[PDB]
Design a protein around this ligand. Structure first.
Ligand code: ATP
Ligand code: ATP
Ligand code: ATP
Ligand code: ATP
Ligand code: ATP
Ligand code: ADP
Ligand code: MG
Ligand code: MG
Ligand code: MG
Ligand code: MG
Ligand code: MG
Lengths: 378, 595, 23, 376, 363
């Protein structure tokens, strides 16, 4: 009755009894079915993990934060709050009248708003293609809401109807990402608040869709046109108060007046994301580089940056206001395009690529003169 | 039997070994074995995306029955792929199809070891519809609900929604067993298991690199097709090419060429002449782009990242804002890049963003949503990129779009996605997205800046960059500019570059006179006079295009119509000679043809 | 200043159908 | 056959009798079809091009390659049948009678074993006895297409592949899309040279080599709703038909006058009375425009630049701003220019821009976007 | 064959089964002027539902059996081809076009048929709304050559929505504007219908019962139109005589009291207007007799043809206007408060008078 919004009770229940009795018959090729044998069958059918989970799957949930921090750098209270949401529902402590977790990932652009939603979906499923990513900037006026719901019956496209409601109907346990939620139309929120209040959602064909088990992420970029400028107005002594205090108020102030307070009522944590620091951009380097080194290993090459080469990338690839997209742009302007010439030169083939800055960098300074040097080995 | 007339004994095919091996799918076949081992609804429907191996699960169940890897309550039960189309075929009288279907169901009760496999289970609705006869599913619906009939169905997720979920009584009688699209690591194991059947058929050898290539390159570069099929398509078609060589290895390069011929995306290993073309890429873009070296280098680095295999595979090949003055080659580099990559400028997807005046012209990009007119067309942008995934997409005059059309294009830049109105995600991960803006020069071009300041000639370009990059930050949301790989503010065309623009624009005029049996020589004193009179330091090369039009062409066009310069050699010497220096606006061109 | 939304319907498609003779 | 001749035509037997047009070029596309047909899982290419880029010609060029023996020895001497699905549906008043005829065809594939079907307009396979969620011709083939038990070439346009084949997403899986590109002008001239003997014998004309160039170059320039290997042939045949109705040679001027009748764009070889009309063009506009010599010259320089063939092919003929005080001949020169070029003031496209003071009346120029009234 | 989709109006005319039309014989002459053309001899009777457009061709059918037609219209048989009856019972592909070709086969066979397609806007959108073969694309070849004489009849709105938007179809049809009658034209219509009523209802109808059916239906009915709603009142008048014989003007005022709902039926009630306004307002009786005073001029005496029925400044106030609306024609709910305190800006001036098209507030 809870986890099936497709069938009816004197059946969806019989089906759990019947498939679990057939489960324990092929275990013998006397045995009982318990509440965990039923929930294993229901988890096999819905995809919703409701079964008594193994000890290997329990310890990775208690270590979810430091397994989400393998992919997202920093962002601690963001990672903690989505970890508290999944651990609340996998402990059987979910409110069964509301979604599994409702979040606004607000903050400056580039700090890991959509990266955490992908890291959460790679955690829960192993894929980022299991992230229902609804790019809400495509939705701009009130009629594009028919993409989320489907057309009404008799209007062309009712047959394929629903690009949100159907992939939640087929995967009720799924992280749903509403990327750039503020760039949608206002009437879409009046349809999406039904999800946050009830957990149900009628599609275009008038059928309620189960969202009780979805992790709803509303990635927002609101309160950042003055956070694209790192110093505020007037005199103040240094950082520590500036990076987060103001931003969190200016983001929340912009969220209170762009959204209805009925919408912001039913969201479990509005997380304003702190912009990335110097000590987190240096740990962002060897994550950006591991994508590049992972592609040279496909071509049977090893990319190893030295400590000075990693340090120089974090020097130039650090805007405090954007974070990790200017780093990623300085990876492809100083590592990748240089290596793309060396590989097309055939001056770098198999073996190590000691990428190290030598021109200068002096371990510090601006390294504006420092150049990255690539060298073959073996 | 009569059951052989309307079906295919699928365990007899598994005993004869004419079913392909089904590697993996242990959890999916076991799940079918559970639902078949029930008593109320013995009926699994395999639902999944098209090509993920739904029919493969049942023909892997058929092998599991033959090899005895099956439960004892499922032991030696023969699968029959019930051809519904053969049950219909011949049923011209009333109660033939019903009589044929009831006779099939008699031989399932009497034998008791039959499992029907109704592949394309959505076609069971219908198939007896003649409006003087009852439905095919209506015959089965009593026997499906009570366990009296073990029937595996297989339907795609679309066709399950479109045709089975719109008959909720039939949907109830089947258990949806999700056959998911396999991972790349699971697909490599499928391809290693199918390795024997494709080597034996094509008389080839398929190295383990080619399985890893076929599963990785199909998952990366194909988005309309699913893994345990699009990787098989690369193995099968590359094995077919090596058979056509002899009319023996299939390796990493053979798969990437098939993926290159199919998607259009160049991913294959390179010849020496095409590698050195990419190192001369700047020098070959400078055959059409005079000057503008910062931007010619920037699009060359983006293409060389892609062909070195160093492109971020979740992002486009390059995201560019070509900004700067009007006429300095922003659109012309996007043309020259498309001529480099393809050979014409018709391969440039040129979305002219001045046609986008309110928010709702973004429906031209990704199509109308469901229920609205023009839902049959998926949008101008999403189709042209779905046909040609490797493209150069020019968003010309990007600031002339409404500001809510950038928000459609935000996730094109970061994710390489633009889901159209029909719901198909289009791959922009191999496109070169070029945005063209005149912002910060649609005014500052005019020389002199409000107030006092040092320098001019190279500090008015730094004044240009500061003006342009501030007009971009004023006009665009900072998350748009965050997602652009390189913003290149363009140089104003110097006097030495306008001299080389004359060589480039007379060559268009001389190329047209080749079609008239003429030649057009243009003397070097006449190159200088066009270069002075065409040099505006703040527009560049479009005023030169007007001077070549006003002084060469408009004077040469009447000389052709006078038939005074017919098929000969128009020399075009200057006469007043403008002393070669100072003003030359008392000077005039003279056109004479010889030979 | 405001859109109109044509909102195209789908049609029932008046159908041919085979029938069944009997002698 | 006997049952397969009723429901299609043997395309390789049409190639033995030489009734197919020569398909010259398209080697990489015919070879690609032979690579797909030589597969074992899904050996079903679908030719995905634009209308008239030569999709049917690739299969007709394949059928000529089978007859000549220029085909692989796994595809050697396979009879190709253009399956006419209209002939399958024709009749079929009773249930199963369509499904009989398709299963009789498919049984005739397996007994002979040397058949390639060519379902031209493969989108017509989606629904041929009933809807998609019922037994149509697509649902009968889908078991055999998926396992390589049936070799079937399809050919749809890009729109017919989107609107109909991708709307039956399981059938799209069964076919391997071979993209037939629109040819270049250099390739179209080679197509037109290879097709010369067919059109110079049907029309009993002699089409010169320059008229082949002037067909492919002028169709690629001045035709924009059609595609090259068909719209250049349209100039060749209609000029060959122009000449046969004059009853010896199709020249450049014969092609360009056919394009002039079809587009309305005067590109033909100028008669001497029309040439001197363009040198007196300023004096012809001064019969309607008193004064304004610098303006009458400028629009006359633009038309003389166009008719001498010195127009930039990427630009309009002229692009003028007529500025100045009210009532001096700004609109009147535009009307006089349309009288010179057409003899009509009604041939002037007056877009009266005072109606466009709204920001949003841009939709009156290019139409409404998808989803709106004024999209039709 | 052609009798299966409509009746023969010419055969009904010579059997006397048609109501005679009095007046609109200039409209009948215009229809004969279209039908006697060669190339597009297809009139479309433009009106609004009840002005008499079936009655025009009812009078044309009576004019054929009287021989008062041109030689190109004598011995013509009119058939009211209902094209909605062609759609009805048509579930199959091709089933619709078959019983339209059976109709057009008898056009070719007889050669003396004039179809009267009532509701000609239905002609667009009978098979596929011009996306494929509809009944318009079947008729458009023969309508353009004069080989099919067809009298259409449609509302002026429906002519613009369906027939004018199909620019190919609008040239095949010739708009004959059948206007709504005047009240004095309606009375002489009902004079000739007196013989049709007295034979059927067993009534005798006096002279001013027609006057009280035509003036009174114009006064209180605005959905319906003149030469139909006044026939309706004499119809429902005998429907009180079937409860019972001479009808009155009170007999028509009875049956309009059924139809509209007001029983009030002006010089008597205008004099003692004050007392029916005192029944909701007691106190402040000087303003009651003041707004009674000027309205005793406007609705009794002299009045400009272009003025509202009195204009007032109020400075209960709105309770008096609600009682004023109750005396005005008989309903309490005719009072419409605009709430002019809910508008203060200039762009809000289009929020109570209608928007320019394209903009917010178009409805
Ligand atoms: N810890 C991290 N923080 C931020 N970005 C990261 C991190 N790890 C990787 N990235 C990469 O940095 C880029 C920007 O990250 P992401 O898109 O999540 O930022 P965002 O704040 O969601 O951006 P926006 O506000 O524009 O939606 C991506 O390429 C992402 O994969
Ligand atoms: N686990 C597997 N092992 C081996 N081959 C597989 C496996 N899964 C799929 N395949 C192969 O991949 C292709 C998928 O075809 P299949 O008929 O199974 O598709 P499907 O998922 O049933 O979808 P549809 O019937 O709609 O095309 C076939 O070549 C099949 O043999
Ligand atoms: N750098 C250049 N090299 C060659 N040709 C150029 C260059 N710059 C401009 N041109 C020529 O000038 C004309 C206009 O060029 P183009 O349209 O690319 O300029 P643009 O800067 O994109 O203009 P706008 O800002 O108006 O869009 C074309 O004829 C083009 O060939
Ligand atoms: N390579 C070629 N060599 C010779 N003739 C060709 C070639 N390509 C096309 N043609 C000819 O051009 C015309 C194109 O018609 P064809 O039916 O082949 O086009 P198509 O792409 O199938 O278009 P459609 O989808 O409209 O049928 C025919 O006259 C054809 O013979
Ligand atoms: N040079 C001219 N030769 C002939 N007629 C002219 C000339 N200038 C104006 N006219 C007359 O003016 C009318 C059409 O020109 P028109 O007044 O539209 O010019 P305009 O410059 O477009 O004016 P405006 O700027 O007010 O639109 C006709 O009456 C025409 O005869
Ligand atoms: N001029 C007229 N003379 C007599 N009766 C008329 C006249 N005009 C309309 N009618 C009456 O109208 C009715 C016929 O309907 P009609 O008014 O023709 O409908 P419509 O205008 O919708 O075609 C009959 O009661 C008929 O007597
Ligand atoms: Mg994001
Ligand atoms: Mg299948
Ligand atoms: Mg440009
Ligand atoms: Mg064709
Ligand atoms: Mg004017």
């Amino acid at each position: 009755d809870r986890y099936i919004n497709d069938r009816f009770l004197p059946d969806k229940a019989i089906d759990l009894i019947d498939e679990a009795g057939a489960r324990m018959r092929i275990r013998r090729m006397v045995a009982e079915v318990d509440d965990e044998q039923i929930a294993e069958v229901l988890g096999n059918w819905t995809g919703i993990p409701v079964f008594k989970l193994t000890e290997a799957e329990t310890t990775r949930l208690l270590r979810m934060e430091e397994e989400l921090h393998k992919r997202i750098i920093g962002q601690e209270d963001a990672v903690k709050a989505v970890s508290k949401a999944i651990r609340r529902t996998r402990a059987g402590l979910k409110d069964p009248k509301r979604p599994s977790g409702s979040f606004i990932f607000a903050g400056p652009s580039g700090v890991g708003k959509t990266e955490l939603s992908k890291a959460l979906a790679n955690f829960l499923f192993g894929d980022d293609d299991a992230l229902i990513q609804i790019d809400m900037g495509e939705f701009h006026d009130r009629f594009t809401a028919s993409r989320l719901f489907g057309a009404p019956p008799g209007y062309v496209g009712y047959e394929e109807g629903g690009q949100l409601t159907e992939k939640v109907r087929r995967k009720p346990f799924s992280v749903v990402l509403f990327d750039a939620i503020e760039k949608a139309h206002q009437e879409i929120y009046n349809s999406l608040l039904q999800v946050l209040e009830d957990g149900r959602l009628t599609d275009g064909q008038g059928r309620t869709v189960d969202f009780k088990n979805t992790v709803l992420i509303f990635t927002s970029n609101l309160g950042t046109s003055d956070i694209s400028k790192p110093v505020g107005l007037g005199f103040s002594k240094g950082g520590g108060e500036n990076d987060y205090e103001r931003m969190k108020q200016k983001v929340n102030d912009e969220l209170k007046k762009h959204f209805r307070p009925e919408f912001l009522n039913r969201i479990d944590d509005i997380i304003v994301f702190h912009q990335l620091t110097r000590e987190e951009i240096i740990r962002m380097v060897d994550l950006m580089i591991s994508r590049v080194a992972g592609q040279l290993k496909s071509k049977d090459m090893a990319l190893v940056l030295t400590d000075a080469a990693k340090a120089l990338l974090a020097k130039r690839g650090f805007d405090p206001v954007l974070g990790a997209r200017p780093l990623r742009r300085t990876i492809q302007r100083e590592i990748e395009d240089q290596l793309s010439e060396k590989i097309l030169f055939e001056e770098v083939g198999p073996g190590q690529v000691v990428t190290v800055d030598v021109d200068n960098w002096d371990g510090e300074g601006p390294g504006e003169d420092a150049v990255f040097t690539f060298t073959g080995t073996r | 039997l009569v059951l052989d007339q309307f079906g295919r004994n699928l365990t007899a095919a598994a005993m004869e070994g004419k079913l392909d091996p089904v590697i993996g799918r242990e959890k999916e076949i076991e799940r079918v074995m559970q639902v078949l081992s029930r008593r109320t609804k013995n009926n699994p429907v395999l639902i999944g995306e098209p090509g993920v191996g739904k029919t493969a699960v049942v023909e892997g169940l058929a092998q599991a029955i033959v090899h005895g890897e099956v439960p004892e309550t499922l032991k030696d039960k023969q699968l029959y792929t019930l051809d519904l189309g053969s049950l219909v075929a011949g049923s011209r009288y009333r109660g033939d199809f019903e009589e044929r279907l009831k006779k099939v169901l008699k031989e399932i009760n009497t034998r008791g070891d039959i499992i029907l496999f109704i592949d394309a289970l959505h076609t069971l609705v219908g198939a007896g519809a003649a409006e003087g006869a009852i439905d095919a599913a209506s015959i089965l619906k009593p026997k499906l609900a009570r366990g009296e009939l073990q029937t595996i169905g297989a339907t795609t997720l679309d066709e399950y929604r479109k045709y089975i979920e719109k008959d909720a009584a039939l949907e109830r009688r089947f258990q949806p067993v999700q056959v998911g699209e396999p991972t790349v690591e699971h697909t490599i194991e499928i391809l290693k298991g199918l390795r024997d059947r494709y080597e034996a058929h094509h008389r080839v050898s398929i190295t383990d690199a080619a399985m890893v290539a076929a599963a990785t390159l199909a998952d990366r570069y194909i988005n309309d097709r699913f893994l345990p099929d699009k990787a098989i398509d690369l193995i099968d078609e590359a094995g077919a090419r090596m058979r056509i060589r002899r009319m023996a290895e299939v390796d990493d390069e053979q798969i990437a060429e098939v993926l290159g011929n199919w998607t259009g995306i160049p991913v294959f290993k390179l010849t020496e002449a095409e590698t050195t073309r990419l190192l001369r890429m700047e020098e070959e873009l400078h055959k059409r782009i005079i000057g503008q070296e910062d931007a010619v280098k920037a699009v060359s680095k983006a293409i060389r990242r892609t062909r070195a295999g160093l492109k971020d595979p979740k992002r486009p090949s390059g995201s560019f804002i070509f900004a700067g003055p009007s006429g300095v080659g922003k659109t012309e580099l996007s043309k020259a890049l498309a001529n480099f990559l393809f050979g014409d400028d018709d391969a440039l997807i040129q979305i002219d963003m001045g046609e986008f005046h309110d928010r709702f012209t973004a429906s031209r990009l990704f199509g109308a949503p469901p229920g609205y007119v023009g839902y049959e067309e998926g949008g101008q942008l999403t189709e042209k990129v779905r046909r040609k995934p490797f493209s150069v997409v020019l968003f010309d005059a990007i600031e002339k779009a409404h500001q809510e059309i950038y928000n459609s294009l935000l996730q094109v830049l970061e994710d390489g996605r633009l889901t159209d109105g029909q719901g198909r995600t289009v791959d922009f991960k191999n496109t070169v997205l070029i945005f063209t803006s005149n912002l910060g020069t649609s005014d500052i071009s005019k020389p002199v800046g409000l107030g006092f300041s040092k320098g001019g000639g190279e500090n008015d370009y730094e004044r240009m960059k500061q003006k342009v990059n501030d007009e971009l930050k004023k006009h665009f949301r900072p998350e748009f500019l965050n997602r652009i790989d390189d913003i290149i503010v363009f140089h104003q065309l110097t006097r030495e570059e306008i001299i080389r623009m004359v060589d480039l624009m007379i060559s268009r005029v001389a190329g047209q006179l080749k079609s008239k049996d003429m030649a057009l020589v243009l003397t070097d004193a006449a190159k200088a006079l066009l270069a002075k009179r065409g040099f505006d330091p703040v527009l560049g090369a479009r005023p030169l295009r007007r001077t070549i039009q006003r002084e060469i062409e408009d004077q040469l066009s009447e000389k052709i119509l006078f038939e005074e310069v017919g098929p000969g050699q128009v020399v075009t010497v200057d006469v007043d000679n403008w002393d070669g220096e100072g003003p030359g606006e008392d000077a005039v061109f003279t056109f004479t043809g010889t030979r | 200043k405001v859109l109109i939304l044509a909102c195209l319907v789908a049609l029932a498609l008046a159908r041919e159908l085979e029938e069944l003779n009997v002698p | 056959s006997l049952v397969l001749d009723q429901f299609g035509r043997n395309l390789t037997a049409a190639a033995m009798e030489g009734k197919l047009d020569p398909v010259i070029g398209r080697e990489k596309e015919i070879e690609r079809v032979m690579q797909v047909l030589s597969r074992r899982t899904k050996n079903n290419p679908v030719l995905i091009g634009e209308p008239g880029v030569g999709k049917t010609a690739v299969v007709e060029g394949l059928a000529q390659a089978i007859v000549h023996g220029e085909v692989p020895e796994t595809l050697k001497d396979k009879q190709l049948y253009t399956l006419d699905l209209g002939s399958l549906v024709a009749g079929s008043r009773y249930r199963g009678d369509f499904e009989e005829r398709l299963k009789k065809v498919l049984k005739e594939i397996n007994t002979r074993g040397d058949i390639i079907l060519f379902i031209d307009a493969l989108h017509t396979l989606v629904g041929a006895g009933a809807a998609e969620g019922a037994i149509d011709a697509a649902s009968i083939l889908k078991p055999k297409l998926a396992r390589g038990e049936l070799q079937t070439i399809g050919a749809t346009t890009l729109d017919e592949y989107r609107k109909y084949i991708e709307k039956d997403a399981a059938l799209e899986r069964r076919f391997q899309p071979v993209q037939v590109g629109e040819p270049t002008v250099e390739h179209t001239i080679e197509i037109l040279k290879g097709l010369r003997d067919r059109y110079e014998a049907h029309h009993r004309v002699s089409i010169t080599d320059a008229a082949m160039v002037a067909a492919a170059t002028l169709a690629d320039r001045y035709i924009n709703d059609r595609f090259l290997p068909d719209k250049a042939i349209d100039l060749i045949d209609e000029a060959g038909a122009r000449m046969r109705i004059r009853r010896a040679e199709v020249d450049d001027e014969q092609i360009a006058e056919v394009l002039g009748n079809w587009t309305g764009i005067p590109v033909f070889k100028l008669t001497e009375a029309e040439t001197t009309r363009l040198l007196r063009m300023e004096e012809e506009l001064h019969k309607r425009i008193i004064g304004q010599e610098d303006a009458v010259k400028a629009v006359s320089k633009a038309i003389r630049r166009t008719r001498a063939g010195l127009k930039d092919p990427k630009r309009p003929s002229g692009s003028f701003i007529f500025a100045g005080p009210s009532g001096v001949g700004k609109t009147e020169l535009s009307k006089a220019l349309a009288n010179f070029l057409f003899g009509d003031d009604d041939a002037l496209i007056q877009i009266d821009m005072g109606e466009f003071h709204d920001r949003f009346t841009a939709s009156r120029l290019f139409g409404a976007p998808p989803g709106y009234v004024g999209y039709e």
